[PDB]
Design a protein around this nucleic acid. Structure first.
Length: 49
RNA sequence: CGGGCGCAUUUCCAGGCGGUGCGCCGCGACCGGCUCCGGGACGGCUGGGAAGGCCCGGCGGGGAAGGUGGCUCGGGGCCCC
């Protein structure tokens, strides 16, 4: 992203800048399981009665 | 140090993305283990054994026996059924 400026030409703007604070000893990532759906994507069952 | 404000940084307000949640609960679909129930089709036997369903022509002997035949009881009009 490059936008115009007032003086000194135009300067490039970097979107999604680097974070400013890092929490120590962050939690690692999961093992990427499968077959797990959210509640909105579950199949709905009904009894014949 | 200096040249410089759509740019970058400091605070508050209101929303979304991935990691975390006072107490008491509930729900959903997948995964593993386990018990139980229902339904439907397949192979073998002596290519299962025995009954069923119509009868034609016909053989055998026999008993846990239709009539015949002393006797017993009862019903209806000595006798009769």
């Amino acid at each position: 992203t490059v936008g115009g400026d007032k003086n000194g030409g135009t300067r490039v703007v970097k979107l999604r800048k680097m974070p400013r604070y890092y929490p120590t000893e962050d939690v690692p990532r999961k093992l990427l399981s499968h077959g797990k759906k959210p509640f909105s994507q579950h199949v709905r069952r009904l009894r014949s009665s």
